[PDB]
Ligand binder design. Structure first.
Ligand SMILES: CC(=O)N1C[C@H]2C[C@@H]1CN2C(=O)C[C@@]1(C(=O)Nc2cncc3ccccc23)CCOc2ccc(Cl)cc21
Ligand SMILES: [Cl-]
Lengths: 302, 298
């Protein structure tokens, strides 16, 4: 028993965190083998940010301009290339603490752990979901750019995100480890705004199933719904349309609890209609959308 | 900006998780130098009588794929101390500390000496923790990383019938009126950690959430009369002093913030949320808020 927002053990990622300094700018880098990955806006000044030509700025940079620091040790940059919005600094030393890793691009609704860093020193770890609007509700301060999001499935670290920018509404924007931003965001100080956010429906349903496994059944009802009828109601509450793929992904949870996916959708329709009514599902007074169907099967079984 | 339930980087603790097997029981152990620490219920109740039957080679310690050979064994309260032939090379700078209820810590959940998750939780006033544990998680540790020193403050032993957990400090002393045996054990009536709620209300102010603030102030005794009614911990003058830095950073006096909390208890959230929550959060200490809203690294 027990349901917590669980992050992956950060150990394998902490051994990768370096400090990347380029002039006055000092952010974080991910050191995997003989390459340090970091946001390309490390080369920008505060004024350049409006309309930077990174290609033009990087060509005026030499290897010894980038000061990489792995703890007290200083790494010697021997090369530099740019892949989309990330800078790839080739270094003289390969990371001995390099784990088994993959660069994965995640879809909105997928969750990951964020290892918050300041000056290449990890300060905290927490669990995040990729919001439908492609932003993350993170906990980031100045100097946290280059902090990575990952998932440790088996003994392999799947790097899925690198922090780049905090939008004016306090939410964050970043890229996959291949430098491709998530969402319609760019690495610029231009007027950018996160789109109208929505609730991750499949994730809420998965959390409602996790509650049933933990003995919470007060929200269940004698009703079922058509998939389309549920989406007409979900749309009104600012919920993501639940697709047939979502239904199939919820299959295992439906079998473990014995409550059909569209049966659990009817419970959710009623929860949206009536609210919690002073009650709490899994210690929460709100409907939680940051636990994927996979996170629930991982935490309630193994 | 941003406020999350943040745990300490588990790295220094992962390098200490071993698998302790004794007969049928397979739980986790904490390997610090040449000693593995684990719940004394792995031999499972006269624990002195049961331990004297077991020999060193009955305990099978496994550090990853490598097997550690046990060369000795002693018992400190509810914690088994297995002397091993090899000292842990990954041993960090550490202390065994005992925490007070209201203090928070990170839990590195393990199954078969393999860390699977890390999370934050608070020592509840009833001395239980609202953790996330399954079968095989006994021996999972709670810690705080201050500077570069890991302060081990908890080792998980069991789960109470209400889903809450009970465990000991690393010296084997249980937190609360709990014992390590299958018997009727119930968690006491829980209370809200008042200082922790106030600290979280300050963190909300820092994050631009100010709707709950009011023109009013109150006294420490008048607030406690109200807090007692709503099952809140009495806010002491020490709590007020500990909230000092937050009060200066936001410009809202501690008893001014107590007056805002007094109205949240009498009137509720009113359909509104503070830091994305519809309930008053009590698992962020005044120091957790100061560290997350200023950025202290390890
Ligand atoms: C300080 C400096 O000269 N620097 C320029 C580069 C290098 C250095 C910092 N830079 C930025 O630009 C970063 C920056 C940004 O969003 N930083 C932050 C990230 N997360 C949390 C924060 C919490 C508070 C304050 C800032 C945070 C500033 C805001 O504007 C943008 C617009 C786009 C993009 Cl891609 C990044 C940014
Ligand atoms: Cl995905």
């Amino acid at each position: 028993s027990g349901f917590r927002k669980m992050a992956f053990p950060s150990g394998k990622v902490e051994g990768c965190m370096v400090q990347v300094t380029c002039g006055t700018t000092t952010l974080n880098g991910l050191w995997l083998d003989d390459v340090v990955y970091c946001p390309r806006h490390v080369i920008c000044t505060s004024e350049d940010m409006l309309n930077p030509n990174y290609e033009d700025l990087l060509i005026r940079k030499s290897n010894h301009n980038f000061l990489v620091q792995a703890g007290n040790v200083q790494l010697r940059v021997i090369g530099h290339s740019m892949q989309n919005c990330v800078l790839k600094l080739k270094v003289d030393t390969a990371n001995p603490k390099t784990p088994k890793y993959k660069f994965v691009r995640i879809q909105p609704g997928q969750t990951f752990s964020v290892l918050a860093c300041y000056n290449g020193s990890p300060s905290g770890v927490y669990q995040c979901a990729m919001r439908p609007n492609f932003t993350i509700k993170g906990s980031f301060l100045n100097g946290s750019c280059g902090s990575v999001g990952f998932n440790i499935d088996y003994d392999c670290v799947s790097f899925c995100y690198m922090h780049h920018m905090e939008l004016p509404t306090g939410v964050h924007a970043g890229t996959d480890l291949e430098g491709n931003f998530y969402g319609p965001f760019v690495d610029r100080q231009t007027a950018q705004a996160a789109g109208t956010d929505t609730t991750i429906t499949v994730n809420v349903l998965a959390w409602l199933y996790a509650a049933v496994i933990n003995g919470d059944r007060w929200f269940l009802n004698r009703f079922t719904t058509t998939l389309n009828d549920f989406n007409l109601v979900a749309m009104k509450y600012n919920y993501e349309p639940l697709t047939q793929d979502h239904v199939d992904i919820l299959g295992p949870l439906s079998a473990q609890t014995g409550i059909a996916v569209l049966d659990m959708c009817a419970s959710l329709k009623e929860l949206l209609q009536n609210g919690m009514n002073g009650r709490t599902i899994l210690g929460s007074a709100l409907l939680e959308d940051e636990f994927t169907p996979f996170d629930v099967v991982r935490q309630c079984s193994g």
